[PDB]
């Protein structure tokens, strides 16, 4: 009696598909043929942040757009002052296999995680003068891929046990768990209104979740391989997904399908990091081909290449005022661009 | 809050960062891989939901980090990129269990032909040799059923520096090594070389074999960077 629920599952899977082809009335490449292009965005390396030992796997900007934390697999975080190339803090970790990093939007806390399967929150505003571990959030089976703060007492952790989880830093336990994926959930981006978040996994599927309810509102099934990087549009109604089939893909929530395909025939390497600008016009994507590219999000034309790194770009982040782009890679150096 | 005292804190951090670069460069990192049947959980005992196990040991005043990755899911195509630029991969294979030896050859094929473990050399520890000696001296389980080409294999001449045994266990154990170097010599480049060894339950020389092989791994990493190849 499994096929009675398997043939009804394929019937709703095509009823989803004919409900999307009815809405696919005009390509975004048709509405954006008469819109002017961007031009050759030629950025320059303004700062270079030296001091990490091993490869950098994650960075995150702060909301002041001046401080940033960077995670390296020598086993420590460094909070940088971007205008000075100073080191505000250097926090040694318990594990040496950190894969995610998150600066809290208040500025008081910072998070990391990795193959230890723990999200470790760090208090930076202690009266003792040193950075101490505030909470050590255990409960995931697989490795931690992405953590993102919502406020000072809640965090959303993506892991490779096919689950995402919303935590509580004071209590230390899971508020709700998100259990829809069938693969290692690799990336995670919150909405600007912090009410929804998307999560891209290794089943070539992005899923839009609700934080309060704990459901999966929409699923997005366009990619051909493992989605490594996800990023919300600044208005909260679209998102871009980077995957290992050398394709970025902009989706949308109100239409529930794919919009554009930022692919190129020369590019075979996969995408490790993806990010939008402040206006949502540029889609900066980091590649395994040692260099980041600046796609234009409405025309899908490569309008710039950032080519300063001598290894795999694994981190990318645009500030909250859109001033700079920081780009961390496996050559132990970050680079801040304008 | 003067900026001159902020850059003095930054140059007190870089002094601490330089003295943890010297510990880091003098420390060799390893990666244990192997199934649950193998004695990977026992070599860490013979040496001196948490998802990673570090095991530090020193031999001849040289520090070694092992990383017995556990508490993970089944698929490893994503976190195996983290262990790129590691010194070696200790791969432990249970040479006694005949029926599950082909999947030990299949996941050794995945390690050796991975895109990120292209430069990394594998130290095979063909474990449980005393359990292999008692299996062909009993003669019950046969290798010819699980592998059809054991009936047409003979022992090579310049081999077997063992004290005492019959060549049934030698033609057995040198064929298991031969199947694991059919993968290292055919589908691999000259950037990384396998190192087969035969290890047992209580064998205290397993930390010396790692030290001798890692000394050879760094020697070809130095012969290539000094352009003497």
């Amino acid at each position, epitope marked *: 009696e499994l096929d009675q629920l398997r043939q009804e599952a394929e019937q709703l899977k095509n009823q989803i598909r004919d409900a999307r082809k009815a809405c696919a009335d005009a390509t975004l490449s048709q509405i954006t043929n008469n819109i002017d292009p961007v031009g050759r965005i030629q950025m320059r390396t303004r700062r270079t942040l030296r001091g990490h030992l091993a490869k950098i796997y994650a960075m995150h900007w702060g909301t002041d757009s*001046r*401080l940033l934390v960077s995670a390296s697999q020598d086993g420590k975080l460094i909070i940088w*002052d971007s205008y*000075t190339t*100073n080191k*505000v*803090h250097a926090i040694p970790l318990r594990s040496s296999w950190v894969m995610t990093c998150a600066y809290a939007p208040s*500025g008081n806390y910072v998070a990391c995680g990795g193959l230890d399967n723990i999200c470790s929150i760090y208090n930076l*505003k202690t*009266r*003792d*003068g*040193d950075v101490r571990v505030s909470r050590e959030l255990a409960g995931h089976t697989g490795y931690l891929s992405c953590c993102r703060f919502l406020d000072d007492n809640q965090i959303v952790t993506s892991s490779g046990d096919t689950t995402c989880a919303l935590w509580d830093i004071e209590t230390g336990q899971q508020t709700t768990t998100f259990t829809g994926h069938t693969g290692d959930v690799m990336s995670l981006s919150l909405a600007p209104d912090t009410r929804l978040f998307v999560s891209g996994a290794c089943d070539a599927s992005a899923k839009l979740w609700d934080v309060r309810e704990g459901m999966c509102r929409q699923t997005f099934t366009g990619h051909e391989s493992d989605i490594n990087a996800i990023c919300f549009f600044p208005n909260g109604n679209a998102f871009a997904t980077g995957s290992d089939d050398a394709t970025c893909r902009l989706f949308d929530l109100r239409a529930d399908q794919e919009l554009m395909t930022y692919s190129h025939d020369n590019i075979i390497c996969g995408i490790t990091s993806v990010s939008f600008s402040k206006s949502g016009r540029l889609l900066l994507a980091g590649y395994d081909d040692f260099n980041c590219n600046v796609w234009d999000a409405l025309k899908a034309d490569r309008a710039g290449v950032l080519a300063g790194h001598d290894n795999r770009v694994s981190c990318l982040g645009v500030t909250d005022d859109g001033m700079a782009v920081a780009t961390g890679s496996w050559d132990s150096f970050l680079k801040i661009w304008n | *809050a*003067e*900026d*001159k*005292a*902020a850059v*003095e*804190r930054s140059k*007190m951090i870089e002094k601490q960062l330089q003295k943890d670069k010297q510990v880091y460069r003098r420390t060799l990192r390893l990666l244990l891989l192997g199934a649950d049947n193998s004695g990977k959980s026992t070599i860490v005992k013979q040496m001196r939901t948490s998802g990673i196990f570090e095991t530090k040991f020193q031999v001849d005043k040289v520090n070694f980090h092992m990383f017995d990755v556990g508490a993970q899911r089944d698929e490893r195509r994503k976190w195996i990129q983290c262990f790129n630029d590691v010194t070696a991969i200790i791969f432990v294979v249970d040479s006694s269990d005949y029926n599950r030896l082909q999947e030990a050859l299949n996941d050794f094929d995945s390690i050796w032909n991975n895109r990120w473990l292209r430069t990394i050399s594998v130290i095979l520890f063909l474990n449980k040799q005393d359990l292999l000696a008692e299996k062909v001296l009993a003669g019950k389980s046969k290798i010819e059923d699980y592998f059809p080409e054991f009936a047409r294999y003979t022992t090579p001449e310049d081999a077997t520096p063992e004290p005492g045994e019959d060549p049934r266990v030698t033609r057995a154990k040198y064929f298991i090594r031969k199947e694991f170097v059919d993968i290292s010599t055919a589908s691999g480049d000259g950037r990384h070389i396998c190192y087969p060894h035969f290890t047992c339950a209580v064998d205290t020389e397993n930390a010396r074999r790692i030290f001798n092989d890692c000394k050879d791994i760094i020697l070809q990493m130095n012969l290539r960077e000094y352009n003497l190849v």
Partner: single-chain antibody
Amino acid sequence: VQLVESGGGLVQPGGSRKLSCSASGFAFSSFGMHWVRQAPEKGLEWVAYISSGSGTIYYADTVKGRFTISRDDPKNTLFLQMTSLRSEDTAMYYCVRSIYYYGSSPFDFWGQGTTLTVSSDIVMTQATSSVPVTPGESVSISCRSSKSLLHSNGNTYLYWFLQRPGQSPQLLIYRMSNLASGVPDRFSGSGSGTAFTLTISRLEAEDVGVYYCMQHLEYPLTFGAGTKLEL
């Protein structure tokens, strides 16, 4: 956190006396610690400074040569060795910690003080030396400087303080606008490039003391005479 000092007593004017402050409760080796003294029935006056790691060591010109500051990061102590003790060095010697990074709050914790009785610079002038207050009003303590404290990086470097009667000074506002941690939201300090203010919006009985000021642009850290409130 705690900073307790030891030393003092009657010293002959040609004599010597070594003070010592024992830090216990914080990471002492990461804090640049100062020495600030207070003559009897007078204001505060800066004496010495030693940085985090015994790097930049700065003295005032009135104690230069005679006074040597030192540090012992394992045993968590801070010393002040005086060689020839002139009679104007009669004071109560406070020991202040100060950490320096982006967003830090220096001069945030002060010691209790030891009484040592012996028997160019940016002048800060607080005009009113006594303000009569009642609990409930909204007062404003003014402050003026010689040079403008607005540096080119973007933030002015004025530091407000409060010394309650009997106690040790505590930091209220750092960098002229930022409320310190532990201070209530009534203290809304603001100001301009050379004219400053500290508005206490609703006064309580704990707000009675001598409100000082400080600059941190040039390293002789000159204080004010102190606006004293009384109820």
